[PDB]
Request: fold
Amino acid sequence: LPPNAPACMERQLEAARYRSDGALLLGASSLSGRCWAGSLWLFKDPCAAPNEGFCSAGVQTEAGVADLTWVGERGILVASDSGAVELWELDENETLIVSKFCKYEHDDIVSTVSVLSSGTQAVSGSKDICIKVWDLAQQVVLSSYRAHAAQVTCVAASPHKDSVFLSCSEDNRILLWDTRCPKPASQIGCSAPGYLPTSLAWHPQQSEVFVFGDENGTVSLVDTKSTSCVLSSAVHSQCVTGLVFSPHSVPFLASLSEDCSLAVLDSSLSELFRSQAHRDFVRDATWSPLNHSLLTTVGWDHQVVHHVVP
Amino acid sequence: RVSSGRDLNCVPEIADTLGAVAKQGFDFLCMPVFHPRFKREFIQEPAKNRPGPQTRSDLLLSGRDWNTLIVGKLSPWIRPDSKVEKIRRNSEAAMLQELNFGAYLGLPAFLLPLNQEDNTNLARVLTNHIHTGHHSSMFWMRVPLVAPEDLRDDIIENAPTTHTEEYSGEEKTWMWWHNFRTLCDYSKRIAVALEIGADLPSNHVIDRWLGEPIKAAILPTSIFLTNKKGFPVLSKMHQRLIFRLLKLEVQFIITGTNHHSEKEFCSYLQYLEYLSQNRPPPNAYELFAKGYEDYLQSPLQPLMDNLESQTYEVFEKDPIKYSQYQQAIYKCLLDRVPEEEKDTNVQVLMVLGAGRGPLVNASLRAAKQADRRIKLYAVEKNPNAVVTLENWQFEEWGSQVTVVSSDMREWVAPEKADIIVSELLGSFADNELSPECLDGAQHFLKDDGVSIPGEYTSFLAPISSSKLYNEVRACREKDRDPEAQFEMPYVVRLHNFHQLSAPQPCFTFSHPNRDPMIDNNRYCTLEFPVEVNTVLHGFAGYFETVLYQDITLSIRPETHSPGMFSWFPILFPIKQPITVREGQTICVRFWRCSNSKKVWYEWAVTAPVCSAIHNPTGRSYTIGL
Ligand SMILES: Nc1nc2cc(O[C@H]3CC[C@@]4(O)[C@@H]3O[C@@H](n3ccc5c(N)ncnc53)[C@@H]4O)ccc2cc1Br
Ligand SMILES: [Cl-]
Ligand SMILES: [Cl-]
Ligand SMILES: [Cl-]
Reply:
């Protein structure tokens, strides 16, 4: 194991993120036992994860990690239980993970982080009900929004627009945000207010469409420009934790749940693949930038699974 | 001083965290007992069989530390009233699990949120935990003054914030609490942890929490303004509410991260201690009535029972009361005997119910100050107090004072009196039976004689107090009516309550009573305009008395005699609380009834809704004649 790297990795795996070069980023939390903290790990060999001794870099954070995101190719943006948004930077040699900034602006657990299209700004959502826009360079909050009436479950930056992002909450709102407008959020959704939204994924090719998962295993296809829901399917038996699109020209949608399964769906939301590999909640999913049919999942069972999607 | 706690949703290492909050000056810590993000499954395989441990060990703290320093918190994903069945069932099982771990640990309090209108199943699961093992533990319902939906930034283009006045809508969170504690059947173990926002609501909304069991106040760091030196401070309005809450002796909870980063978490706390120390000090009445706040006591029945020595001693610890009696006798002697008669006219003064003699000495001080001559008869039925009187007359008073060990209604007096003086009044004026006692004595008063007191009037005001209603409810005794507690009045230093309308006079008595057909029985109808949305739990009683002319005593708050602390107010409860809406009138009916043997009160509310007639035939409560 490298220097500064913790001798042991925390059981609860929170995030799995493939970098453009192929190096896997790992977010971990200790959600039980004596100490409730976290760790950040780099795996230049994704097949060596979760093994601690066969890693490129590793660090320990003060509190657990609720959300993670690659900021470029060296930066790591962390949503902490501490109320902090943390930015860590990879070493010149990429052998250490050093803290750039740790800012305590949120009044409760920071649950969701998203990097804005340019890579200069970021958006965070919290249990404190706020949404904050961050200037990563100045290490400051530019805008704090209290649009929601309950905890912010998810925030997703639009692919190619630095002003646009999606947000969802336990207040049953899915908000479209344009910081260019005097009133930046706009309430969008289906004709009927159903089950609470739990996950969002912007479409990688159609910048006016997104997918949203709910608390009851339903996945929904939404055109923002038509503001009425077209397709929907009961994919999972429990809350949809995450939605991640394949890098493909015609993308595949990977769906995660508390039902402990992974589903891979086509354009019409039909089921292609299904993996019951996990024996605990599936927390993240990342498609390899190298082999496009290779999808990686992490759960609370401490399994780093590598699936081959047909 | 201030008892305060630190609210946290992140505790990486319990020992270091506790030490840090202790260093900062906090008395206790509010913290999760399971990891807030650690969602647990109880039904579906494989997540159900998740290897343990399910949380941190109890071994990490001493029993004393768990019992006194830790307030547990329900996990935020526990949603017993969710519209998703699977969630409802897992949240029920998770709620019991966490509540049971808190009970296992012996935690002194445990926080649960009220963050939506419907908490029916949250209440069912809590109620079921309270009825599983008898424990002392408190449940603090975290409720905001302003619901987050009514606090949200007006930034949603297609969903604007309401800019219109919504009197009842702005009071919505009080109803969340009311319904929750109604469902839970007014458990004494369920109190409020009132969370205060950056913008305070209209005063009516703050007033809705009056009379409610507030155990804690939650102050987010974000509501603190920054002063010129950079220290956390509060708005004059927030300061106003802190002073109300200090009088209620609530525990102050600091939630949120440090936003005055140039300082420490002890600076938020330092400001509260500053506000606490700088509040007005306790006056004579405020120091007297210290441990008596909302403590229910049986009204004294000095006619039926002989009062103890230490009861007359506290009775005597009231300089204002006796100064007033002195001034009343002083004024009367001067009006009764002119300066040219100041040596030929010796006034025959009678102290009727003389106790240990404070009105006998007050009569003597009055005669010396008036430079007039007096003859005194000290009448006392209590033989034990008569021992003090006879040792006083032998050792000091001399032949001037004639001690009579008799009931004033049975005493055959040798001569008539010019003035009869007495202190037979209770908190409701006539409740100790001063009318009956003086009526049976006025036969020995001269045809032109004076009674000190000459007149008295009782007053009633409608009140709201879920604290006192629950206090009365807890007065169930075996071998009597299960509801008799509500059909009797209590003497209490009414503290956590809300006066719903100004007091109005109830019964008046005049002495001497020149009626050819003397009737002490009464019937009075009172109509009380209520301008708030509230819940009626009873009627506060007070009194005013005219001793002589302009010399008066009063316990009516609007005319209260300054520095006089003999009588605390009376409280007449009602079996069932009554909902009262703004603009509605509370109509009460009060009766003063009697026999040859006993006297009592009966009462009933007839608007906005009817109550049962309370204490019919004096079945629950009588005053012995
Ligand atoms: N609520 C309060 N009631 C007070 C009453 C007091 O004086 C009363 C009570 C004690 C006392 O010494 C005396 O009058 C006597 N007393 C009664 C009835 C009566 C009879 N019929 N004949 C003679 N004696 C008779 C009886 O024994 C004195 C102070 C009081 C303070 C407060 Br606060
Ligand atoms: Cl309800
Ligand atoms: Cl009692
Ligand atoms: Cl009041």
Notes: The radius of gyration of chain A is 18 Å. Residues 1-310 of chain A form one domain. The first strand of chain A starts at residue 12 and ends at 18.
